[PDB]
Design an enzyme around this catalytic site. Structure first.
Site, PDB file in Angstrom:
ATOM      1  N   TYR A   9      37.217  12.944 -66.918  1.00  0.00           N
ATOM      2  CA  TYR A   9      36.139  13.717 -67.528  1.00  0.00           C
ATOM      3  C   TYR A   9      36.587  14.446 -68.780  1.00  0.00           C
ATOM      4  O   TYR A   9      35.829  14.553 -69.741  1.00  0.00           O
ATOM      5  CB  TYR A   9      35.605  14.759 -66.549  1.00  0.00           C
ATOM      6  CG  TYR A   9      34.500  14.280 -65.653  1.00  0.00           C
ATOM      7  CD1 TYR A   9      34.697  13.219 -64.778  1.00  0.00           C
ATOM      8  CD2 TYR A   9      33.255  14.901 -65.670  1.00  0.00           C
ATOM      9  CE1 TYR A   9      33.676  12.786 -63.936  1.00  0.00           C
ATOM     10  CE2 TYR A   9      32.230  14.482 -64.834  1.00  0.00           C
ATOM     11  CZ  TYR A   9      32.445  13.426 -63.970  1.00  0.00           C
ATOM     12  OH  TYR A   9      31.438  13.017 -63.132  1.00  0.00           O
ATOM     13  N   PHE A  60      27.248  28.004 -60.078  1.00  0.00           N
ATOM     14  CA  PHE A  60      27.517  26.801 -59.312  1.00  0.00           C
ATOM     15  C   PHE A  60      27.843  27.132 -57.861  1.00  0.00           C
ATOM     16  O   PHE A  60      27.355  26.469 -56.945  1.00  0.00           O
ATOM     17  CB  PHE A  60      28.686  26.031 -59.939  1.00  0.00           C
ATOM     18  CG  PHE A  60      29.238  24.954 -59.047  1.00  0.00           C
ATOM     19  CD1 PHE A  60      28.549  23.766 -58.861  1.00  0.00           C
ATOM     20  CD2 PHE A  60      30.398  25.174 -58.313  1.00  0.00           C
ATOM     21  CE1 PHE A  60      28.994  22.822 -57.952  1.00  0.00           C
ATOM     22  CE2 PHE A  60      30.850  24.232 -57.402  1.00  0.00           C
ATOM     23  CZ  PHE A  60      30.144  23.052 -57.218  1.00  0.00           C
ATOM     24  N   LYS A  78      26.993  20.186 -63.876  1.00  0.00           N
ATOM     25  CA  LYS A  78      27.229  19.497 -65.139  1.00  0.00           C
ATOM     26  C   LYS A  78      27.340  20.564 -66.218  1.00  0.00           C
ATOM     27  O   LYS A  78      27.952  20.350 -67.258  1.00  0.00           O
ATOM     28  CB  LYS A  78      26.078  18.534 -65.460  1.00  0.00           C
ATOM     29  CG  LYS A  78      25.598  17.692 -64.277  1.00  0.00           C
ATOM     30  CD  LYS A  78      26.710  16.863 -63.640  1.00  0.00           C
ATOM     31  CE  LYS A  78      26.290  16.387 -62.250  1.00  0.00           C
ATOM     32  NZ  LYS A  78      25.223  15.351 -62.247  1.00  0.00           N
ATOM     33  N   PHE A  96      35.798  22.202 -55.070  1.00  0.00           N
ATOM     34  CA  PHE A  96      35.328  21.152 -54.174  1.00  0.00           C
ATOM     35  C   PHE A  96      35.721  21.511 -52.762  1.00  0.00           C
ATOM     36  O   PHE A  96      34.988  21.238 -51.815  1.00  0.00           O
ATOM     37  CB  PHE A  96      35.941  19.815 -54.547  1.00  0.00           C
ATOM     38  CG  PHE A  96      35.280  19.159 -55.716  1.00  0.00           C
ATOM     39  CD1 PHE A  96      36.046  18.634 -56.757  1.00  0.00           C
ATOM     40  CD2 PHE A  96      33.894  19.041 -55.774  1.00  0.00           C
ATOM     41  CE1 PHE A  96      35.447  18.000 -57.836  1.00  0.00           C
ATOM     42  CE2 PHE A  96      33.288  18.407 -56.849  1.00  0.00           C
ATOM     43  CZ  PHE A  96      34.078  17.887 -57.877  1.00  0.00           C
ATOM     44  N   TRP A 139      35.017   6.280 -63.277  1.00  0.00           N
ATOM     45  CA  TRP A 139      35.316   6.830 -61.973  1.00  0.00           C
ATOM     46  C   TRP A 139      34.362   6.254 -60.933  1.00  0.00           C
ATOM     47  O   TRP A 139      34.794   5.668 -59.946  1.00  0.00           O
ATOM     48  CB  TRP A 139      35.201   8.354 -61.999  1.00  0.00           C
ATOM     49  CG  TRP A 139      35.478   8.965 -60.673  1.00  0.00           C
ATOM     50  CD1 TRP A 139      36.649   8.906 -59.964  1.00  0.00           C
ATOM     51  CD2 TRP A 139      34.547   9.669 -59.853  1.00  0.00           C
ATOM     52  NE1 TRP A 139      36.496   9.527 -58.750  1.00  0.00           N
ATOM     53  CE2 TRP A 139      35.215  10.003 -58.656  1.00  0.00           C
ATOM     54  CE3 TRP A 139      33.207  10.048 -60.012  1.00  0.00           C
ATOM     55  CZ2 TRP A 139      34.586  10.701 -57.620  1.00  0.00           C
ATOM     56  CZ3 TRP A 139      32.580  10.742 -58.981  1.00  0.00           C
ATOM     57  CH2 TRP A 139      33.271  11.059 -57.801  1.00  0.00           C
TER      58      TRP A 139
HETATM   59  C1  LIG Z   1      29.467  17.832 -60.858  1.00  0.00           C
HETATM   60  C2  LIG Z   1      30.687  18.090 -59.972  1.00  0.00           C
HETATM   61  C3  LIG Z   1      30.758  19.446 -59.279  1.00  0.00           C
HETATM   62  C4  LIG Z   1      31.679  17.178 -59.788  1.00  0.00           C
HETATM   63  C5  LIG Z   1      31.814  15.770 -60.376  1.00  0.00           C
HETATM   64  C6  LIG Z   1      31.460  14.610 -59.389  1.00  0.00           C
HETATM   65  C7  LIG Z   1      29.982  14.580 -58.995  1.00  0.00           C
HETATM   66  C8  LIG Z   1      28.956  14.282 -60.099  1.00  0.00           C
HETATM   67  C9  LIG Z   1      29.606  14.841 -57.700  1.00  0.00           C
HETATM   68  C10 LIG Z   1      28.197  14.901 -57.067  1.00  0.00           C
HETATM   69  C11 LIG Z   1      27.187  13.744 -57.330  1.00  0.00           C
HETATM   70  C12 LIG Z   1      25.852  14.189 -57.936  1.00  0.00           C
HETATM   71  C13 LIG Z   1      25.111  15.387 -57.325  1.00  0.00           C
HETATM   72  C14 LIG Z   1      25.327  13.531 -59.000  1.00  0.00           C
HETATM   73  C15 LIG Z   1      24.014  13.850 -59.711  1.00  0.00           C
HETATM   74  O1  LIG Z   1      23.075  12.853 -59.332  1.00  0.00           O
END
Ligand SMILES: CC(C)=CCC/C(C)=C/CC/C(C)=C/CO
EC number: 4.2.3.9
Length: 290
Positions: free
Chosen positions: A53, A139, A167, A73, A285
Site C-alpha cells: 500500500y 476508525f 481508507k 488489526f 495483494w
Molecule cells: C482498510 C483496512 C483497515 C485495511 C486494508 C485491508 C482491507 C481493505 C480490509 C477490509 C475489506 C473491506 C471492508 C473492503 C471494502 O469493501
C-alpha cells in the site's frame, strides 16, 4: 480474468527486513491466545500488505505504518469478539493512551504497544504524526459493531464506501509514511480523487472476497448482480470494467490537477501517485492472498 490495467503495483524495498522486525516485535509483546493464533497472525502478513500500500514510504518510516496497521488489526479482531459496551469501553481506555495523556499499564500489551508506538511517531515527526491521530480514533470507534447492513442499490453502496473510515486512515498514514506535508486547501481539493480511490479499493476487494464471504452481506458483487440480474461471473466481469473505468477517472483528475493553472505542488503530486499505489498494491495483494 481481470482486464488490463494501466498501473503497476510496487512493494516497499525493505519489506523483508521490516516484516521480520515488526512481526517479531508482536511475537515478543502481544499476548496471543494460542500457538494456532500465532500461525493465523503470521499468515496475515500485515507488514507485507502495508508495504504494498505504501511502497513510496520513507525507509525510516515504513515500519511505523506496519506497526500501526498491525496493532489496529489485532485490536479490530478483539473488538469484534466483545459486546458493544465492552468494546466501547476498550477504546475509551486506549485512545487517551494513544494521545499520550495517560501512561500504559505495561502489563497490558494493548496499552503499552499503542503508547510506545505513538510516542515514537510523534518523536519522529509530531506535525504529521498528529495528522494520523484522529483518523485512527474514528476508525477505532467505528469498530464498535451495532446495526450496519442492507444496501441494495449500486449508488448508495458506492457512496457508502467512499466514506470508509479505514481508507481515510490509510491516506493519512500514507502522508506520514511518505513525509508528505500538504496544506488544508490541497487536502480539501483532494476529496474527489480520494473518494474515487476509496471506491475503487472497495470494489476490487469485493470482487476477490465474494466467494469466501459465502456461508449464510455488503458487497458490490451482490448488489449489482441483483440489480442487473446477472450471474456472479458476469457481475464480476462488469465490476472489473467499472473498476478499470474508475482508474481512468483517477488519471484524468490527476492530469487535470497537475496541468492546472494554479499549479500542482510537489507534495501534492507525490500524494496522488501514492493513491495510485494503494489501488495497484491493493489489487496485487487481493489476488495473492488468504
Ligand atoms: C482498510 C483496512 C483497515 C485495511 C486494508 C485491508 C482491507 C481493505 C480490509 C477490509 C475489506 C473491506 C471492508 C473492503 C471494502 O469493501
Amino acid at each position: 480474468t481481470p482486464p488490463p490495467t494501466q498501473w503497476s503495483y510496487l512493494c516497499h524495498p525493505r519489506v523483508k527486513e521490516v516484516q521480520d522486525e515488526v512481526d517479531g516485535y508482536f511475537l515478543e509483546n502481544w499476548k496471543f491466545p494460542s500457538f494456532k493464533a500465532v500461525r493465523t497472525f503470521l499468515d496475515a502478513k500485515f507488514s507485507e500488505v502495508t508495504c504494498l500500500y505504501f511502497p513510496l514510504a520513507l525507509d525510516d518510516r515504513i515500519h511505523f505504518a506496519c506497526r500501526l496497521l498491525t496493532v489496529l488489526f489485532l485490536i479490530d479482531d478483539v473488538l469484534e469478539h466483545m459486546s458493544f459496551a465492552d468494546g466501547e469501553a476498550y477504546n475509551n481506555r486506549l485512545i487517551p493512551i494513544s494521545r499520550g495523556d495517560v501512561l500504559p499499564d505495561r502489563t497490558k500489551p494493548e496499552e503499552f504497544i499503542l503508547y510506545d508506538l505513538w510516542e515514537s511517531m510523534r518523536a519522529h515527526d509530531a506535525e504529521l504524526a498528529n495528522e494520523v491521530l484522529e483518523p485512527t480514533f474514528v476508525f477505532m470507534r467505528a469498530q464498535t459493531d451495532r446495526a450496519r447492513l442492507s444496501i441494495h442499490e449500486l449508488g448508495h453502496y458506492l457512496e457508502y464506501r467512499e466514506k470508509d473510515v479505514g481508507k481515510a486512515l490509510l491516506s493519512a498514514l500514507m502522508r506520514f509514511s511518505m513525509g508528505l506535508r500538504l496544506s488544508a486547501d490541497e487536502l480539501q481539493d483532494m476529496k474527489a480523487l480520494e473518494a474515487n480511490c476509496a471506491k475503487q479499493l472497495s470494489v476490487v476487494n469485493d470482487i476477490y472476497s465474494y466467494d469466501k464471504e459465502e456461508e449464510a452481506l455488503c458487497s458490490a458483487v451482490k448488489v449489482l448482480a441483483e440489480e442487473s440480474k446477472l450471474g456472479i461471473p458476469a457481475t464480476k466481469r462488469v465490476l472489473w470494467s467499472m473498476t478499470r473505468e474508475w482508474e481512468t477517472v483517477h488519471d484524468e483528475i490527476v492530469a487535470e490537477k497537475i496541468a492546472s493553472p494554479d499549479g500542482c505542488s510537489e507534495a501534492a503530486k507525490a500524494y496522488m501517485k501514492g493513491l495510485e499505489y494503494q489501488m495497484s498494491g491493493n489489487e496485487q495483494w487481493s489476488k495473492t492472498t488468504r
